[PDB]
Amino acid sequence: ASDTAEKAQAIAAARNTFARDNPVSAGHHERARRSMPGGNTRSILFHRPFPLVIAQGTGSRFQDVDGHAYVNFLGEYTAGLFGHSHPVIRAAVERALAVGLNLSTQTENEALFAEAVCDRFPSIDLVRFTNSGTEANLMALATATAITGRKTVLAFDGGYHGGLLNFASGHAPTNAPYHVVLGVYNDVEGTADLLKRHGHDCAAILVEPMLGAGGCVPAERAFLDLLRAEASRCGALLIFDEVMTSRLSGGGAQEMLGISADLTTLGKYIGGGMSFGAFGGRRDLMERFDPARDGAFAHAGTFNNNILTMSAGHAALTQIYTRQAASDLSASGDRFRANLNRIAVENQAPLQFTGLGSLGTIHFSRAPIRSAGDVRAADQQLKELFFFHMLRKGIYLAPRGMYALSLEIADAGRDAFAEALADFIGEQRALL
Amino acid sequence: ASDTAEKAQAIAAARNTFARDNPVSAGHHERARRSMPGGNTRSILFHRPFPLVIAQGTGSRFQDVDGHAYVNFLGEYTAGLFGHSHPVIRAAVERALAVGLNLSTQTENEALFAEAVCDRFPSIDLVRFTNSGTEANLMALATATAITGRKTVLAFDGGYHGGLLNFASGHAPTNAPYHVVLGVYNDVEGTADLLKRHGHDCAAILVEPMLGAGGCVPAERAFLDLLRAEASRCGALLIFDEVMTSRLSGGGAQEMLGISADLTTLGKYIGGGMSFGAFGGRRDLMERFDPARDGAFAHAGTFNNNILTMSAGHAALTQIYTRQAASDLSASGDRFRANLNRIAVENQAPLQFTGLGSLGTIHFSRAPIRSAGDVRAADQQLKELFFFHMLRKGIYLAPRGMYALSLEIADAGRDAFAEALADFIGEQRALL
Numbered sequence A, B: 001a002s003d004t005a006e007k008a009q010a011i012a013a014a015r016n017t018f019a020r021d022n023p024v025s026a027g028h029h030e031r032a033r034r035s036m037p038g039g040n041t042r043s044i045l046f047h048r049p050f051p052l053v054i055a056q057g058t059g060s061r062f063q064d065v066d067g068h069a070y071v072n073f074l075g076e077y078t079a080g081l082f083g084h085s086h087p088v089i090r091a092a093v094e095r096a097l098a099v100g101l102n103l104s105t106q107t108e109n110e111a112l113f114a115e116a117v118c119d120r121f122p123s124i125d126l127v128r129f130t131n132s133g134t135e136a137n138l139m140a141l142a143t144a145t146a147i148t149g150r151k152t153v154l155a156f157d158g159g160y161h162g163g164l165l166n167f168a169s170g171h172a173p174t175n176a177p178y179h180v181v182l183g184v185y186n187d188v189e190g191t192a193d194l195l196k197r198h199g200h201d202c203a204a205i206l207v208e209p210m211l212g213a214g215g216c217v218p219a220e221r222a223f224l225d226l227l228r229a230e231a232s233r234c235g236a237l238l239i240f241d242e243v244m245t246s247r248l249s250g251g252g253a254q255e256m257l258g259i260s261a262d263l264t265t266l267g268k269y270i271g272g273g274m275s276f277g278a279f280g281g282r283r284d285l286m287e288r289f290d291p292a293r294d295g296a297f298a299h300a301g302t303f304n305n306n307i308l309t310m311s312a313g314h315a316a317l318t319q320i321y322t323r324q325a326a327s328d329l330s331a332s333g334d335r336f337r338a339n340l341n342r343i344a345v346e347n348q349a350p351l352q353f354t355g356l357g358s359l360g361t362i363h364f365s366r367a368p369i370r371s372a373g374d375v376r377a378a379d380q381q382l383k384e385l386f387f388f389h390m391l392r393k394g395i396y397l398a399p400r401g402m403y404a405l406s407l408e409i410a411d412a413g414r415d416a417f418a419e420a421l422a423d424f425i426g427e428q429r430a431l432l
């Protein structure tokens, strides 16, 4: 996928149309720049020429400050599973307020939520709550390094484990300075080599069962089988980062695969749209945090047990996104992704959607997408054009071309997405 | 302060009375142990024989599951500034729900909140939001290490900077493996020596202007003057962890001191009781996160800009805890602490309360409390007895003897606290 002047000119024109369409968002951006770096507090939300500012949303719909309406296919990078105004989440928030905020003590609600997590995730015997997936993964590494007394962590290029463990572009100088060795996702022979070299000092292997932010790239069974066998052989803890993949069945990727990680990290939708993360796993590892134990590890955090997350999360798992709901949404998402790919094939379009269940990302290539290198080698210019095209069609998804279907997406939204994809292929024929 | 058998017997009896008083909390604990390590998800909430479970609370009051009522002097370790059911916070939550949850985009609300932070904190030119003080301090270290290209961080024994940077008991194997050198809090000559040895590779000095969790121990001006002069001299970033101290005036400890840190971390009450943290500081440091810049640092995080925190936090700073409110509460807290100390002096009690403004901790010693070593050397057995005594009197504060006055504490609560302290001194005369 080589950059062309024609594609760059098309991007320039699309950015210009977006800018002309959205002068109020542009004004907001100039003001926001005065208080936050680049008017930004979450890097992924920025895109050129400037990001949209949204005024309000209900269900699957939102409206920008210029008055334009969209269907939200982004769904908060998988956290926004309930849409913008779910009545059961609202009711949980109301119940939480009636219990009381900042009670400075435990409530029964945290235990009920923990039970709901333990009931449905087959390798989580005990769990602790954090305030983000970033904290969950940090605590999983804290656990593995403290238990094993080892320092080396095996992770994968393209892997994303939060703001301090971001390997989406390889090593980053802002990452917490764990001794991380990066392998290639899905590369069996290369990873086997790394584990022979490093296994002796390996505290943990940290891996998503599908690269999420890194392109909705499913792990192959052979790759995960290697990690499970070698973690056990060398005495490293296998950590499955299921922050995104947990939604894929009642029991996440582990239920689907019949493979158990030693620790599992969770985040995003499970707190019902409230701040949330969790790390859990084997009883004998997690019991090291029992505060009554001699030599207990400490896991602090002011908002860990906050009543809003405990209430909304329990509702999310037991009242809304039940195990059957997870199966249904994943089957719905599979049919959706298949339809998009069918549209590509029918039109001889050099593009595909990868992913699992209700999660997907477009890639402008028909080569196998198996690692971060494959994702990067696909056409990035067409990817940007696709984002702006979908916006003009009233469809909002990630700038990077990822959707994550919420429970509020229905036939009308799915049809509109499919139609807009067909229109993109037609209108951009010269560039494809 | 030496352990005696008499004091241990008194602790045994107090624990037994607590247990007899609270069989329903005891039942909850046994069940909670099945899903969370030690039935716990936040280490500080555990105490022997078991912790209370709270059923509900409004204002400054709460009720445990056995039906006992208390005045909450803990105030969520300073986060619970608004009490359990503040109507202005409720209204902000309602407004947030009307805007919409998980909108997957920026709203104007994040910019308004950032402006409110920048307006009142005199050294914060630009700010970014995180989901906890733990994340804020981690991002401050990420910033300092990435900008300077250096690895060494100077922090202080007794210092607490979140779940991955906990030095309350010195080094901990679960802390993120930053190269941290620990000094003695308030030790000018010792710290000067460390900075001569380490200043060349010092990325940052990380310090609370008052040890919070570590005993409400004010920093002396000479100590902070050393840190500011030496950070500037060697090119390390001075980071003031104001997660607790920010409440002490309109502009936190920095306004009071007339000393500016290079970066400031914030947390706890500023998000209005919602999940919250922030790091901010000098424009030229923070602009490194402008996503439009060549070589921009990334700062991710799903819930950074969540509408509940943006709304409630803006309300917290502009509608409730204004700069004048901060001055008034700190003066109120000073009068309160002075009254407690007066009661000690009047009764020849070998105890004191240290702190600033509306924050205080009891120490069973009349020696100067200037460092973590002083805190640890004070009588820990009387400290535990004090906690149980206050509970029996319907007064709830931290097991470690810390209070953090909320805006809902009034004359009745303050009088009851003072009375219960006098009663403790009288009833425990044999042990004092």
Ligand SMILES: *Cc1c(COP(=O)(O)O)cnc(C)c1O
Binding pocket: A077, A131, A132, A133, A134, A135, A137, A160, A161, A162, A163, A208, A212, A213, A241, A242, A243, A244, A267, A268, A276, A277, B300, B301, B302, B303
């Ligand atoms: C979003 C995400 C995280 C981080 O969670 P925040 O709550 O820190 O965004 C970690 N891992 C994966 C796989 C994620 O997708």
Ligand SMILES: *Cc1c(COP(=O)(O)O)cnc(C)c1O
Binding pocket: A300, A301, A302, A303, B077, B131, B132, B133, B134, B135, B137, B160, B161, B162, B163, B208, B212, B213, B241, B242, B243, B244, B267, B268, B276, B277
């Ligand atoms: C509570 C606290 C933190 C951590 O904040 P969480 O939101 O991570 O509890 C960090 N620093 C200080 C000084 C604190 O008091």
